[PDB]
Write a protein that binds this DNA or RNA. Structure first.
Ligand SMILES: [Mg+2]
Ligand SMILES: [Mg+2]
Ligand SMILES: [Mg+2]
Ligand SMILES: [Mg+2]
Ligand SMILES: [Mg+2]
Ligand SMILES: [Mg+2]
Ligand SMILES: [Mg+2]
Ligand SMILES: [Mg+2]
Ligand SMILES: [Mg+2]
Ligand SMILES: [Mg+2]
Ligand SMILES: [Mg+2]
Ligand SMILES: [Mg+2]
Ligand SMILES: [Mg+2]
Ligand SMILES: [Mg+2]
Ligand SMILES: [Mg+2]
Ligand SMILES: [Mg+2]
Ligand SMILES: [Mg+2]
Ligand SMILES: [Mg+2]
Ligand SMILES: [Mg+2]
Ligand SMILES: [Mg+2]
Ligand SMILES: [Mg+2]
Ligand SMILES: [Mg+2]
Ligand SMILES: [Mg+2]
Ligand SMILES: [Mg+2]
Ligand SMILES: [Mg+2]
Lengths: 25, 66, 83, 181, 116
RNA sequence: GGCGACACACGUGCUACAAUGCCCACUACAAAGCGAUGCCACCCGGCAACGGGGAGCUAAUCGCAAAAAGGUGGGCCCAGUUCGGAUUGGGGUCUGCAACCCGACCCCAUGAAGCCGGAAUCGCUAGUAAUCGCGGAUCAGCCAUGCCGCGGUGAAUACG
RNA sequence: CGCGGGGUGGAGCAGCCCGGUAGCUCGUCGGGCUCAUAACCCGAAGGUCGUCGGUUCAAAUCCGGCCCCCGCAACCA
RNA sequence: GGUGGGGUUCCCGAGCGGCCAAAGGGAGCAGACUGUAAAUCUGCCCGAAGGUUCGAAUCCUUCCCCCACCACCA
RNA sequence: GCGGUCGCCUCCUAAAAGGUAACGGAGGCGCCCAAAGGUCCCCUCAGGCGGGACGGAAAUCCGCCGGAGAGCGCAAGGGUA
């Protein structure tokens, strides 16, 4: 959920990046 | 011992992270065991695995030079 | 948690006076307004009077206080409960 | 079943080291193990005997003896308990069967206790017997974890012919009891 | 089957069932799977009792776990108190430790409300 | 130093309590704004935050940029659970003279309350409500879930 | 002195017969409605049972004492 | 001691030889209406043993209690 | 008169046999148990101290010490391992 920083959409919520939301194309 | 209504208690085979415990002598022969110690896992012949002692230490070290 | 790991910041106001108290032959009570700094190892066994905003609180210093700031041992508020 | 490794280990390891240490003049004077008595206070089950009989089924499985039932000596009101109700189970065991049980207890049971930095060495009662309590019953090999309705522990009492404490310690030490030093 | 302390998981999946241990989950799970070369999609209900000891010893000996962890966590927390530090006496008062605000809902740390 | 207190009480909110749902992969389609004392492609090291290196752009040129929901495929199988992420332990990145009080962020561990909410009470009549992301302002950094805007998909119902 | 009844949350009352888990109305506290108060609505807290002994496994409850209370009595003289 | 009535789902209550989860009422729960409280409305949910028949809550024997009544007391 | 009382058991009064009074001091009974009865066979308390998971002043368990202070259905007395 948007409050678990350890999920994809979690990190999208705070709009940060990381292991669970890496920046790539 | 009273005859009837009593468990058999027959010579058995116990296994573990180690080899076999030959002694046994219990009802329900051939039993499996999580971890037996006295073959020296678990604090006997203590390995003290994943030990630390770093509570004071860590901020004494990396902070030493940095 | 938190951070530095390059620079390990501590004020040089007192670090001077502490280093000078290392090899002096004397140990006494050093009044400081610096809670921003970090404590030890050359600090340990020394008594520092730290400011909470109101006064300087005496604090004895020992080894398990290591990585900690000097303001942690000088709390700023006064509570004693509600009722 | 007269072999029993621990029994032997008492005679060909322990008895000798014992005489060497305390310097006993007589054959009999050196400490013997008599009587490990196991006991469950079960008063958690009062008006339900169904809970009791499953627990005595349990002991027999680990001990090899059907336990006794202990009954309320006096009525004590504050927690239930009128007089004569079943309180818990108690089994005495000796002579071989104590051996075969103590053997398992040392090699298997105690290793399977969460934490377990070893057995507290103040439980020697000063006339030289030792006592220990256990939290759950599945630390014994005979228990399968799918047979447990609820975890109930016990009291183990071990009696020595050792007149003193320091002696009784030695005996159990040398038998391989993991004391916390 | 059994793991440090006891903690028997069952059915579900090997990788998920390892979460159910204290000290382990997500990251520490999926890692110990490939390092013992075991399929995480497999149900623990059925596997080789080999993969069971491969898993056990790794996980048990790699990093400290339920009994040992829980006592170490409690250990620092003791040291935070009794040293007298602010981090510590917020552990004393059962109050919030890192920042936040106690004027309104602290509840998790504070406990149920006691009205007046 | 305090405005950050905390037995408590209230307003406005965010995240939820799950299977029209959660997680992982791959794959799409916007608008408005912003930036050369800044925006930063691309390459390397790092699990990552980020750190190096470094090209373009005074910008319909180059950059923030990935839009998210959605689509496909696979997993979870009704469980206080692969729901939910509160607390707390440890480990680090960055701004800054300085993050103890009081920062934001990353990772490992921890996983709380919560199973749709008493009396009551709020919004909304259409590209509205619901839901989904994105941008600015202020600003070193940020406690922004706020505010002011942008488009994405897109209901119900008005007897009277 | 005599006899009968009693004493329990802040108030007023049940419960005591018949041993085992203290209830009711009001009041108090937190919320709701109101511009606001009162009424009303949704929640909550609060008593060791006058006191000291005793009986029992267990006493507000059964027994004894003391202490206050209400009622009746004190006639022939 | 005697006579007559009983005994039904939590309470009351009708209860019949062709089955009557067993009328009905209220209580409880969930809905609708709601200033408060209700009223109204909709759904949810055979004393005992034995015995007679194919069928027993129904008929008989028996047993246990209740209610009622009359009578007696050395 | 009013009040209390009225038979039964226990203790004291009662003066070391028995018995003995007062509106002398204190308590109890009007039941109970098909086992709480007969017999045979075993067993021995309370309490204190040390030990022992949930177990606390006391649930059950183990050690030692404890000659009866426990128990004997109910009041007291006598009795009693
Ligand atoms: Mg989640
Ligand atoms: Mg002894
Ligand atoms: Mg604060
Ligand atoms: Mg403010
Ligand atoms: Mg908000
Ligand atoms: Mg152009
Ligand atoms: Mg819950
Ligand atoms: Mg701070
Ligand atoms: Mg659920
Ligand atoms: Mg709500
Ligand atoms: Mg309109
Ligand atoms: Mg959502
Ligand atoms: Mg935003
Ligand atoms: Mg009010
Ligand atoms: Mg009002
Ligand atoms: Mg009493
Ligand atoms: Mg006259
Ligand atoms: Mg209403
Ligand atoms: Mg008279
Ligand atoms: Mg005489
Ligand atoms: Mg005489
Ligand atoms: Mg009398
Ligand atoms: Mg005793
Ligand atoms: Mg004792
Ligand atoms: Mg006696």
């Amino acid at each position: 959920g948007k409050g678990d920083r350890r999920t994809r959409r979690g990190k999208i919520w705070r709009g940060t990046y990381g292991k669970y939301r890496p920046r790539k194309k | 011992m009273k005859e009837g209504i009593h468990p058999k208690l027959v010579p058995a085979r116990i296994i573990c992270g180690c080899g076999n415990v030959i002694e046994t002598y219990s009802t329900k022969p051939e039993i499996y065991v999580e971890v037996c110690s006295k073959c020296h896992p678990f604090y006997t012949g203590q390995q003290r695995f994943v030990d630390t002692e770093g509570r004071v230490e860590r901020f004494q070290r990396r902070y030493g030079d940095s | 948690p938190r951070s530095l790991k390059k620079g390990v910041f501590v004020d040089d106001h007192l670090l001077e006076k502490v280093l000078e108290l290392n090899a002096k032959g004397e140990k006494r009570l050093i009044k400081t307004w610096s809670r921003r700094s970090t404590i030890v190892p050359e600090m340990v066994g020394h008594t520092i009077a730290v400011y909470n905003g109101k006064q300087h609180v005496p604090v004895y210093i020992t080894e398990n206080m290591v990585g900690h700031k000097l303001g942690e041992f000088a709390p700023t508020r006064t509570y004693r409960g509600h009722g | 079943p007269l072999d029993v490794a621990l029994k032997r280990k008492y005679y060909e390891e322990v008895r000798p080291e014992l005489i060497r240490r305390f310097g006993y003049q007589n054959v009999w004077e050196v400490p013997r193990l008599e009587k490990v008595v196991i006991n469950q206070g079960l008063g958690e089950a009062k008006e339900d005997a169904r809970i009791l009989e499953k627990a005595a089924q349990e002991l027999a499985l680990i001990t090899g003896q059907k336990p006794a039932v202990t009954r309320a000596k006096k009525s004590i009101s504050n927690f239930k308990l009128r007089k004569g109700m079943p309180i818990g189970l108690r089994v005495t065991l000796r002579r071989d069967r104590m051996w075969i049980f103590l053997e398992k207890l040392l090699n298997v049971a105690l290793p399977r206790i969460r934490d377990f930095r070893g057995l507290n060495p103040n439980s020697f009662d000063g006339r030289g017997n030792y006592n220990l309590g256990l939290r759950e019953q599945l630390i014994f090999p005979e228990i399968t974890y799918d047979m447990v309705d609820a975890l109930r522990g016990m009291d183990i009492a071990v009696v020595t012919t050792a007149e003193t404490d320091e002696e009784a310690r030695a005996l159990l030490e040398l038998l391989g009891f993991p004391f916390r030093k | 089957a059994r793991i440090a302390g006891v903690e028997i998981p069952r059915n579900k999946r090997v990788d998920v069932a390892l979460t159910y241990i204290y000290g382990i989950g997500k990251a520490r799970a999926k890692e110990a799977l490939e390092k013992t070369g075991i399929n995480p999609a497999t149900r623990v209900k059925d596997l080789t009792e080999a993969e069971v000891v491969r898993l056990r010893e790794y996980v048990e000996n790699t990093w400290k776990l339920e009994g040992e962890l829980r006592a170490e966590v409690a250990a620092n927390i003791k040291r935070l108190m009794d040293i007298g530090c602010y981090r510590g006496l917020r552990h004393r008062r059962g109050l919030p430790v890192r920042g936040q605000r106690t004027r309104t809902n602290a509840r998790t740390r504070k406990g149920p409300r006691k009205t007046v």
